[PDB]
């Protein structure tokens, strides 16, 4: 169809939402999940260290 400058406008909102999520959301949740994994991995690891 007839293209429109909106193709230029939309890119800005896209890159802004990327800039925001990239820092305000992702590392937060990355930690929030990695911490839950590590707390179980270390539990079973230390328990094996005890049995040995």
């Amino acid at each position: 169809m007839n293209l429109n400058a909106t193709i230029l406008g939309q890119a800005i909102a896209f890159v802004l939402f990327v800039l925001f999520c990239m820092k305000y959301v992702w590392p937060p949740l990355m930690a929030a999940i990695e911490k839950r994994q590590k707390e179980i991995a270390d539990g079973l690891a230390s328990a094996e260290r005890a049995h040995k």
Binding site: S46, A47, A50, H51
Partner: protein
């Protein structure tokens, strides 16, 4: 039960230090009374020889 493992690891090594103590104390006493019997015998066989 990590610390149940710690508990057993404390206990059995305590018990080793105890049993391997009394074994050697007991064998030392056996050696003491054997070297006692040695004198009780040697000084009694002398009487036999002088009576002879």
């Amino acid at each position: 039960d990590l610390d149940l493992a710690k508990a057993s690891a404390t206990d059995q090594l305590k018990k080793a230090k105890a049993e391997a103590q009394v074994i050697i104390e007991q064998a030392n006493k056996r050696r003491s009374q054997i070297l006692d019997e040695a004198k009780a015998e040697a000084e009694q066989e002398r009487t036999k020889i002088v009576a002879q």
